[PDB]
Amino acid sequence: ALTCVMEGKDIEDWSCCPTPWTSFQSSCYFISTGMQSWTKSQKNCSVMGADLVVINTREEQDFIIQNLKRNSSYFLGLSDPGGRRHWQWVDQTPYNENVTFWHSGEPNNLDERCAIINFRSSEEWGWNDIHCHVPQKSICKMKKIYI
Numbered sequence: 001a002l003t004c005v006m007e008g009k010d011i012e013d014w015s016c017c018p019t020p021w022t023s024f025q026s027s028c029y030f031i032s033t034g035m036q037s038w039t040k041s042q043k044n045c046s047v048m049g050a051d052l053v054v055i056n057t058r059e060e061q062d063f064i065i066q067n068l069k070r071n072s073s074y075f076l077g078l079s080d081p082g083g084r085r086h087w088q089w090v091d092q093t094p095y096n097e098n099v100t101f102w103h104s105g106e107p108n109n110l111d112e113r114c115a116i117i118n119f120r121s122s123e124e125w126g127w128n129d130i131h132c133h134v135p136q137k138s139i140c141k142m143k144k145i146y147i
């Protein structure tokens with residue numbers, strides 16, 4: 001069961017998400033309020049035909065927080081599996097540090113090898129590295145279905 005919207009004034013352009021997902025541009029976003037490790041959460045999206053969310057742009061980043069609660073922490077699809085400060089996205093796109101959104105003095109721990117987005121007074125939203133086994137919520141992202 002897809003939900004379909006007319007992108008722009010063009011009429012044969014219908015993009016679609018499965019009902020619970022929400023749309024922004026070319027992609028669909030789902031917030032998983034269950035509490036699981038990073039590993040499990042990405043496998044959770046892997047079924048759904050998705051990955052953990054990847055943030056390339058400030059506008060994407062902005063659209064995303066409109067769906068989040070500030071009292072919460074959500075896994076990103078961004079890690080450093082070997083603690084070498086060599087960051088990877090789960091979708092195999094490049095990691096451009098000139099367009100990231102870490103909190104001040106994050107990342108701050110070679111032992112913390114996943115990344116969450118969360119809310120800090122005044123800094124607002126931003127990224128922080130934490131421990132994988134520590135169960136958290138997650139955001140998933142896939143490409144929209146077209147019809």
Ligand SMILES: CC(=O)N[C@H]1[C@H](O[C@H]2[C@@H](O)[C@H](O)[C@@H](CO)O[C@@H]2O)O[C@H](CO)[C@@H](O[C@@H]2O[C@H](CO)[C@H](O)[C@H](O)[C@H]2O)[C@@H]1O
Nearest residue numbers: 071072073106108109112118120128129130131134135136
């Ligand atoms: C302030 C903050 O981000 N706290 C989270 C904490 O961060 C660590 C650390 O990675 C960070 O660099 C440092 C800088 O001040 O602060 C802390 O030491 O990491 C934990 C998990 O390891 C997060 O806890 C999670 O928070 C959720 C709600 O926001 C929820 O309660 C989860 O159950 C909880 O594990 C901190 O948010």
Ligand SMILES: [Ca+2]
Nearest residue numbers: 108112128129
């Ligand atoms: Ca950290």
